[PDB]
Amino acid sequence: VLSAADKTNTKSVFAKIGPHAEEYGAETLERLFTTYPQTKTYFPHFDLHHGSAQVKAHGKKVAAALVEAANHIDDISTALSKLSDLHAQKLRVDPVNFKLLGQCFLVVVAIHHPSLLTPEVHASLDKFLCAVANVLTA
């Protein structure tokens, strides 16, 4: 589980990135699709070119889901209720891609916020991304 220190660390990164969530959501997907191109096949109904309105529109929603998980971090299963049917049962997203997206998210934060992801805070945010993955794949 996420320890008290983990929840504080993750809330503290989200406080700092929150005003840019929307732009980091976008960049995270851009990096996902570029670094791990095989993930595109889930979004075949998107135009997936740099600066697409669908990618930017979707990034905003993904970052918002993360903000909500961070805001209700005591109970992430309940807060992310309706995304679990969708990813697990409908989209049939291979569980390995959740780490990829999470990995791309941490690269975005690192780029923009040097010295925010200390080793400890990195560790906490890793456990948070994992617990979120676990909710979406259940």
Partner: peptide
Amino acid sequence: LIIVLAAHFAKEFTPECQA
């Protein structure tokens, strides 16, 4: 290491570069 480089290089660590 990818995350360490991200922090180190900022915007120079482009998507293509990460790939």
